[PDB]
Amino acid sequence: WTATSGSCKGRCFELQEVGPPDCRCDNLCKSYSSCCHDFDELCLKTARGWECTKDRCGEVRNEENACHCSEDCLSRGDCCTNYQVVCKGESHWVDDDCEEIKVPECPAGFVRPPLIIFSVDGFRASYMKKGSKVMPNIEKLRSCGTHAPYMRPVYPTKTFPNLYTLATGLYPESHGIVGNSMYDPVFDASFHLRGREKFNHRWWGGQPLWITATKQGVRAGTFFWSVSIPHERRILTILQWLSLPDNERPSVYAFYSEQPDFSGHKYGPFGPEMTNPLREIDKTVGQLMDGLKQLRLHRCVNVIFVGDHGMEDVTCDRTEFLSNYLTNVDDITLVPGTLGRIRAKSINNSKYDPKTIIAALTCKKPDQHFKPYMKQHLPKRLHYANNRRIEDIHLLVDRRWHVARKPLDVYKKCFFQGDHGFDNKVNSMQTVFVGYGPTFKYRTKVPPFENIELYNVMCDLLGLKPAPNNGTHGSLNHLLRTNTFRPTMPDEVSRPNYPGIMYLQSEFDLGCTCDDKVENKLEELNKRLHTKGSTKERHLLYGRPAVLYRTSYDILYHTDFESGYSEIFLMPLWTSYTISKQAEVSSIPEHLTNCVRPDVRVSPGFSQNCLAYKNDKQMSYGFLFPPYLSSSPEAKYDAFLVTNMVPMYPAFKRVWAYFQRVLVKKYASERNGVNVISGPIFDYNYDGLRDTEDEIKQYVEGSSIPVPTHYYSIITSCLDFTQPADKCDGPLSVSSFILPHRPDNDESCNSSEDESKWVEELMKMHTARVRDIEHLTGLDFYRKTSRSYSEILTLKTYLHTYES
Ligand SMILES: *[C@@H]1O[C@H](CO)[C@@H](O[C@@H]2O[C@H](CO)[C@@H](O[C@H]3O[C@H](CO[C@H]4O[C@H](CO)[C@@H](O)[C@H](O[C@H]5O[C@H](CO)[C@@H](O)[C@H](O)[C@@H]5O[C@H]5O[C@H](CO)[C@@H](O)[C@H](O)[C@@H]5O)[C@@H]4O)[C@@H](O)[C@H](O[C@H]4O[C@H](CO)[C@@H](O)[C@H](O)[C@@H]4O[C@H]4O[C@H](CO)[C@@H](O)[C@H](O)[C@@H]4O)[C@@H]3O)[C@H](O)[C@H]2NC(C)=O)[C@H](O)[C@H]1NC(C)=O
Ligand SMILES: CC(C)(C)c1ccc(/C=C2\SC(N3CCCC3)=NC2=O)cc1
Ligand SMILES: CC(C)(C)c1ccc(/C=C2\SC(N3CCCC3)=NC2=O)cc1
Ligand SMILES: [Ca+2]
Ligand SMILES: [Cl-]
Ligand SMILES: [Zn+2]
């Protein structure tokens, strides 16, 4: 209830929300049905349109007009955005040549360049190039300011999760908006797109930009707009606020357009009906920039043109139905569409079993257009598991397809031709970023980046300290002329030990055997040099990784590789080696197939043992540095040290062996040498962060050997591939993966075929940023390069997506 007896006279689009039952006059009062009786009359005026006509100049001021063309409108700050063009002979902003904005050019009393965020729903990235002919204003912003060819959304590529990620810099799993529709079991409450539960603040985690501004003394205009307020009225309201006195005028503003998403759903991303929505958006941008020019703010305000997600061709006939796979279709609740989330319908049914649900959905039809996962097995780059609102069972739907429970739900519950929500590396889901203003760079193209990084930049643009978020602050410094936050490398917490030869062979009782007794002071001294690190510059190209947590580990040097061996986890945290383009792949000799050798540098108590692997009928072992890439037969014995061994399921050894025997050499051939850092990851609570020792849920049977949940590799080479990886002078090139360490290959429907048909596809799906691996390991990479730290931060956020 609201007693709407107050008036909006002199209160239109007020910046403070008043307390009930007093009626409201702010730009959101419609969505709460709380506007004063005269809000439409006084605030949402429409008479005479939104533009000045030639016969309106100098007119007598009439307050009933939506905007004014009188002589006093500049003083009142309420001219139509084209007033100066029509009445005072000015040019439109799009028609001016663009001149570099070297310094802010602001009117007296502007403490900082304002920031205006022009956000567009469903603005697929390829629109910038394909619609450029009909978007002149947007094309000027893109070409004269700073732009990326595309910006990567977060998963799910849905509207609420991506808009709130932009506002907070957080993964949806962290800010709590994990979909457009959610059920929180702890609340026992449902979050709906259409409804009023979505207004309870308990759903919204993190600290969004408008709260960060407010808490730090930077005034924010109200970012949000009731759908019935026309776009022209939104722009006029923003320009009016920009005419407020200095003490009252906000420094950050937001405009939002429901287009082109609204039409894209009906007509498909490139339907011929999509041209006019693109024209309309551009005209709105033109009205804003014309209005800024009138206020002498067009070389003062920083403008961000940004989307939330793209749009894909999706039709009714391309739907998969769970009733075609399950018998107990009525026992499950499904969140349908471009993703699937499954949970039990009733808690009082213990005859519900997720394992049988997953099995019935796994590789059951040859053309199957979705893949089931337990959420902890989803690719780690999606960062979509660590929230109670994310159901245990997830369906990753192929692009251009939908998943639904029963056919009933589609025809009675085709209309649409477009949709979004798919995996965030899918091209059709990519969206746009353009920055224009004094603080952005001039005519600068930046590489594609993720929308989680924008929050830090928007705080930089406003002089705000960002709340803790998942961006990497400084990785977007190359977007900015000034205001850059200058990051510093984190300090190493644990320094390593450098053990020498301290143990005799007979001190070990590991149950391991090796046929290695076949055995020159020139070459005896030569291999001692290798154990002391004489070849470390060759295999450790960017310095040792820094351990950012308290632990006990040893640096181990070898002819072909270098490792940081954890005495807590009884295995390397990282193994580093360089494979040149000329390097040759050998085989494991027949007599060294089961060879495992004690490391006389590491005590028996801090070593694995072969007996555990013999007894554990589920667990085999593999090696981090591959024996196949040994530089010599004598060096190959190094690769069989017990300190190079890691536990691996036989099913995963298929994946790992093909990567080590075939793919590393192929990458070295293609990239002119590669440097590889590989190691284990433990994330049993799927929070994306390094597990401590007491969080490990699985050990090699009868031992204290922890079982990794994942294995990573970071594959670095020279960006200029005419230079070898080990002699690179300039920027680096990286691709990484975080392979799930699973006892089966059910994820790969073609896994019964040869590894050359499925392993690399699996690895592409689990591509990762170096930053993702740092979170999961507590390690800091690229400590010692000749490149600037900000550039290294950009390299660490890079994701190799394998799209075309
Ligand atoms: C991306 O970026 C984010 C942001 O930096 C980062 O997330 C942060 O991770 C931290 C570690 O996981 C975590 O630190 C402390 O969290 C809790 C409580 O924090 C509260 O205060 C903050 C600040 O205001 C709130 O934002 C936070 O809200 C959370 O919960 C709300 C609902 O409850 C929700 O709306 C909100 O979005 C957020 O939810 C998310 O985070 C929580 C974690 O809090 C998840 O569980 C959710 O699933 C959701 O994902 C909170 O209200 C502290 O209590 C912790 O202290 C622990 O652990 C300490 C470790 O040193 C230890 O000293 C303490 O003993 C304590 O243990 C207690 O609890 C034990 C088990 O419950 C118990 O056994 C023991 O006895 C003891 O009582 C943490 O110090 C941050 O909150 C978190 N921030 C955010 C915004 O999520 C992400 O890690 C990265 N992601 C990547 C991949 O890098
Ligand atoms: C998707 C979109 C349009 C971006 C959006 C929509 C609704 C809200 C609502 C919020 S946020 C909130 N908070 C933030 C932390 C403190 C309390 N309380 C709310 O009711 C926010 C954002
Ligand atoms: C980029 C940034 C600063 C995070 C931002 C700024 C403004 C808005 C405003 C919105 S979103 C919205 N919706 C979404 C679903 C339908 C209605 N209505 C609005 O007025 C949203 C996000
Ligand atoms: Ca963890
Ligand atoms: Cl959803
Ligand atoms: Zn949409």
The sign one gets for the Cα dihedral 466, 468, 470, 475 is positive
Task: Give the orientation angle of helix 159-168 with respect to helix 454-462, to 10 degrees.
Answer: 40
Distance from Cα 470 to the centre of ligand 1, integer Å:
13
Alpha-carbon distances of 193 from 82, 197, 402, 744, rounded to whole Å = 37, 9, 19, 38
CB 478 within 8 A of CB 794: yes
Residue with tokens 């005519």: 443
- Assigned token pair, 172: 């949806």
Distance from Cα 288 to the centre of ligand 3, integer Å:
17
Query: In this structure, what are the phi and psi dihedrals at residue 309, rounded to the nearest 5 degrees?
Result: -170, 170
CA dihedral 690, 694, 695, 701 (to 10 degrees): 110
Alpha-carbon distances of 733 from 17, 460, 723, 798, rounded to whole Å = 50, 27, 12, 9
Pocket test of ligand 2: the residue of 117, 120, 164 to mutate, having most ligand atoms within 8 Å of its CB, is 164
Nearest ligand 3 atom to alpha carbon 226: 20
Alpha-carbon distances of 456 from 280, 293, 557, rounded to whole Å = 30, 28, 40
Residues with CB under 5 A from ligand 6 (ion): 261
205 ligand 1 Cβ < 6 A: yes
Nearest ligand 3 atom to alpha carbon 223: 7
Ligand nearest to the CA of 168: 3
Q: Which residues are annotated as a binding site for 1-hexadecanoyl-sn-glycero-3-phosphate?
A: 159, 180, 261, 420
Pocket test of ligand 1: the residue of 168, 173, 174 to mutate, having most ligand atoms within 8 Å of its CB, is 174
Query: In this structure, what are the phi and psi dihedrals at residue 23, rounded to the nearest 5 degrees?
Result: -75, 160
DSSP designation for 542? S
Distance from Cα 172 to the centre of ligand 5, integer Å:
12
Ligand nearest to the CA of 385: 1
Ligand nearest to the CA of 207: 2
- Assigned token pair, 411: 């025809």
Ramachandran bin of 299, using left for φ above 0, alpha for ψ from -120 to 50, beta for the remaining angles: alpha
Question: Among 449, 400, 424, 402, which residue's Cα sits nearest to residue 269?
Answer: 400
CB 586 within 8 A of CB 636: yes
Q: Which residues are CB-neighbours of 427 under 8 A, at least 6 positions away?
A: 125, 126, 310, 803, 804
174 ligand 1 Cβ < 6 A: yes
Distance from Cα 168 to the centre of ligand 3, integer Å:
13
Obtained via which technique? X-ray
The binding-site residues of ligand 3, defined as CB within 6 angstroms of any ligand atom, are 117, 119, 159, 163, 166-167, 209, 223-225, 254, 256
237 is an active site residue:
no
Catalytic-role residue among 157, 159, 284, 716? 159
Q: Specify which residues 714 forms β-bridges with.
A: 677, 736
Concatenated DSSP letters of 64-118: TBSSB-STTHHHHT-B-TTHHHHHS-PPPGGGSPP----S----TT-SS--EEEE
- Assigned token pair, 187: 């609340």
Q: Specify which residues 571 forms β-bridges with.
A: 566
Nearest ligand 2 atom to alpha carbon 206: 15
Task: Give the orientation angle of helix 770-777 with respect to helix 789-797, to 10 degrees.
Answer: 90
CA distance 713 to 618: 24
Distance from Cα 161 to the centre of ligand 1, integer Å:
19
Q: Please tell me whether the peptide bond between 260 and the residue prior to it is cis, using omega within 30 degrees of 0.
A: yes
Nearest ligand 3 atom to alpha carbon 164: 4
Pocket test of ligand 3: the residue of 223, 258, 458, 464 to mutate, having most ligand atoms within 8 Å of its CB, is 223
Ligand nearest to the CA of 175: 1
Nearest ligand 1 atom to alpha carbon 687: 93
Q: Which residues are annotated as a binding site?
A: 121, 159, 180, 261, 265, 308-309, 420, 683, 685, 687, 689, 691
CB 781 within 8 A of CB 770: yes
Residue with tokens 């707009």: 225
Atom 91 of ligand 1, residue of closest alpha carbon: 470
Q: Please tell me whether the peptide bond between 21 and the residue prior to it is cis, using omega within 30 degrees of 0.
A: yes
Q: Which residues are CB-neighbours of 274 under 8 A, at least 6 positions away?
A: 131, 260, 263, 264, 267, 268
CA distance 156 to 158: 5
Distance from Cα 314 to the centre of ligand 3, integer Å:
24
CA distance 613 to 623: 14
Atom 9 of ligand 2, residue of closest alpha carbon: 199
Resolution of this PDB entry, in A? 2.0
168 ligand 1 Cβ < 6 A: no
- Assigned token pair, 648: 């691996």
Alpha-carbon distances of 577 from 96, 441, 514, 535, 652, rounded to whole Å = 55, 39, 24, 10, 22
